[PDB]
């Protein structure tokens, strides 16, 4: 049973829906574990409740019969999880990520260099929208002429249709591969074994799929939502940023605290329990909303405000935490920071159209809104 979670908050705007700061504040301090008569969900907004749900497996369960929303790799509880784990995290080495770093940054480098004379800006068709997808593109080792957009904007049945031709696309790629090892996400997914266990070429596309999925959408969000934040939240972190410029990692983590909306994951209760202090039963669906638990004041000091100097900014839940945490955090953060360092480094100042509008330029996304169109005036120095 998919459940809508959009009923819970029924919010009058997408502006609001895009930036529920108001509606958190008021679950924190009336409601922090709130019951949803409507869709028969528990909510749960405290940072300490948030943690226990998303980590605490014997009591939460990742794999129950109701959901939030090809190895269902997410729908695993240890310990099954732990294989499809272990396989998927032969990609994410400290060695790969290291060597990602230069092919990222000269596909931002590009990015930018094509905009670098530009008075104004579209961040989401210049840069938020194409960077994450280039990126897979490179880290998959995908041949350098199908450098794929296309892809996820339909794999968003429309469904059945796209993933069947994405299979086709990548099926022949992979057995290639297989005799043709290379530096790339594929070539570590055909080497990957677990206690004598190795993907088959399917399960490797499906595997790809399952990373299109996670880390395409999810990463242009969060791109788009930190230069969002440069132009209308603390108007004076552009300027800071252009003035040292080792604080882009600092402006990364606190953008992921602050401008992701709306993260929420949901469990189902393995184990009767009272541990949020509310007695749950066996089957009870709890949906943990991560974005609301970042601007816990109990973990975040002036948790309403941006601080990139606030020094618990690391321990926001945006990514997950405990055997889920988000396998694609590390390139999530590397994205994040060299497109702003590019970026950094071609425009000393930034500015929003007085004229712009936010209702009118946010769709329906599986985070809530996202921005279509995000203007801005650039100058160089
Ligand atoms: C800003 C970008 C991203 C955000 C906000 C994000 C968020 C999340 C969250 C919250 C989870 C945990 C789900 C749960 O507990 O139920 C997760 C899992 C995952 N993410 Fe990310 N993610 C991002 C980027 C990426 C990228 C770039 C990749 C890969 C290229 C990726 C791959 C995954 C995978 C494979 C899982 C499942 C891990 C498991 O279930 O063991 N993500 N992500």
């Known amino acids: 049973?998919?459940?809508?979670?959009?009923?819970?908050?029924?919010?009058?705007?997408?502006?609001?829906?895009?930036?529920?700061?108001?509606?958190?504040?008021?679950?924190?301090?009336?409601?922090?574990?709130?019951?949803?008569?409507?869709?028969?969900?528990?909510?749960?907004?405290?940072?300490?409740?948030?943690?226990?749900?998303?980590?605490?497996?014997?009591?939460?369960?990742?794999?129950?019969?109701?959901?939030?929303?090809?190895?269902?790799?997410?729908?695993?509880?240890?310990?099954?999880?732990?294989?499809?784990?272990?396989?998927?995290?032969?990609?994410?080495?400290?060695?790969?990520?290291?060597?990602?770093?230069?092919?990222?940054?000269?596909?931002?480098?590009?990015?930018?260099?094509?905009?670098?004379?530009?008075?104004?800006?579209?961040?989401?068709?210049?840069?938020?929208s194409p960077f994450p997808s280039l990126?897979?593109?490179?880290?998959?080792?995908?041949?350098?002429?199908?450098?794929?957009?296309?892809?996820?904007?339909?794999?968003?049945?429309?469904?059945?249709?796209?993933?069947?031709?994405?299979?086709?696309?990548?099926?022949?790629?992979?057995?290639?591969?297989?005799?043709?090892?290379?530096?790339?996400?594929?070539?570590?997914?055909?080497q990957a074994e677990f206690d004598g266990e190795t993907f088959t070429d399917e399960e490797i596309v499906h595997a790809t799929m399952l990373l299109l999925g996670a880390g395409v959408e999810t990463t242009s969000h969060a791109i788009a939502n930190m230069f969002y934040s440069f132009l209308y939240d603390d108007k004076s972190l552009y300027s800071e940023l252009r003035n040292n410029r080792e604080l882009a990692p600092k402006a990364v983590e606190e953008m992921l605290r602050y401008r992701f909306h709306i993260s929420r994951r949901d469990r189902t209760v393995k184990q009767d329990n009272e541990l949020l202090g509310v007695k749950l039963k066996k089957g009870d669906v709890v949906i943990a909303w991560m974005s609301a638990c970042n601007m816990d004041e109990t973990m975040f000091e002036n948790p309403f405000s941006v601080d990139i100097h606030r020094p618990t900014n690391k321990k926001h839940l945006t990514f997950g935490n405990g055997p889920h945490f988000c396998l694609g955090a590390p390139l999530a953060r590397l994205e994040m920071k060299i497109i702003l360092e590019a970026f950094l480094e071609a425009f000393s100042h930034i500015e929003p159209f007085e004229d712009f509008e936010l209702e009118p330029h946010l769709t329906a996304s599986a985070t809530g809104q996202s921005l279509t169109y995000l203007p801005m005036t650039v100058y160089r120095h």
């Open 135 to 190: 990126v897979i593109a490179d880290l998959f080792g995908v041949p350098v002429k199908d450098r794929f957009k296309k892809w996820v904007d339909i794999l968003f049945q429309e469904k059945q249709r796209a993933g069947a031709e994405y299979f086709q696309y990548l099926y022949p790629i992979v057995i290639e591969k297989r005799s043709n090892l290379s530096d790339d996400i594929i070539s570590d997914l055909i």
């Open 1 to 128: 049973e998919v459940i809508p979670v959009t009923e819970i908050p029924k919010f009058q705007s997408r502006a609001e829906e895009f930036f529920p700061i108001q509606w958190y504040k008021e679950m924190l301090n009336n409601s922090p574990v709130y019951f949803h008569e409507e869709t028969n969900t528990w909510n749960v907004f405290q940072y300490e409740h948030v943690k226990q749900v998303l980590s605490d497996y014997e009591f939460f369960s990742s794999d129950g019969q109701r959901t939030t929303i090809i190895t269902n790799l997410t729908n695993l509880d240890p310990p099954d999880h732990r294989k499809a784990r272990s396989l998927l995290a032969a990609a994410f080495t400290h060695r790969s990520l290291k060597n990602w770093e230069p092919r990222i940054k000269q596909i931002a480098a590009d990015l930018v260099e094509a905009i670098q004379k530009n008075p104004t800006i579209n961040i989401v068709d210049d840069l938020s």
